[PDB]
Design a protein around this ligand. Structure first.
Ligand SMILES: [Cu+2]
Ligand SMILES: [Zn+2]
Ligand SMILES: [Zn+2]
Ligand SMILES: [Zn+2]
Ligand SMILES: [Zn+2]
Length: 153
């Protein structure tokens, strides 16, 4: 099996450790871990394109979209590779991640290894919003914490 870890950090209180595991090179990817320091409620959770040696959330930029699709939720047919939907934070600011996804992969041509995991200020509207921006980013507001998705050491 192949494994990865992303350490989420930002300029504020938001931080977390996210794990990835893929047991077969074309198998589903499981994603788990906890993020603390969040406001209660939904927060967009995305793999962004940025793979260069930049500091922080600054350049993370657009969603990881190697197939040039529109933005969606993780269960939508039309989605970016990086569209992992929302995570939910409880009253003391902790969001537990538990995701199984069929579109991301840790191996092959469009592997998410080296790309940037991002947790957002607000909910992702899942591409169902009333403007073109919804179909690009899901209108999830600022990037609160980010980290490179690295092969586990
Ligand atoms: Cu995003
Ligand atoms: Zn590059
Ligand atoms: Zn870059
Ligand atoms: Zn390609
Ligand atoms: Zn997207």
């Amino acid at each position: 099996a192949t494994k990865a870890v992303a350490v989420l950090k930002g300029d504020g209180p938001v931080q977390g450790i996210i794990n990835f595991e893929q047991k077969e090179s074309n198998g589903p990817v499981k994603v788990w871990g906890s993020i603390k320091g969040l406001t209660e409620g939904l927060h967009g959770f995305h793999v962004h394109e940025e793979e260069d040696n930049t500091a922080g959330c600054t350049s993370a930029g657009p969603h990881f979209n190697p197939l040039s699709r529109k933005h969606g939720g993780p269960k939508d047919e039309e989605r970016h590779v990086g569209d992992l939907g929302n995570v939910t934070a409880d009253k003391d600011g902790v969001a537990d991640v538990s995701i199984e996804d069929s579109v991301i992969s840790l191996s092959g041509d469009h592997a998410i290894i080296g790309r940037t995991l991002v947790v957002h200020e607000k909910a992702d509207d899942l591409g169902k919003g009333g403007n073109e921006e919804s179909t690009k980013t899901g209108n999830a507001g600022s990037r609160l914490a980010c980290g490179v998705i690295g092969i586990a050491q």
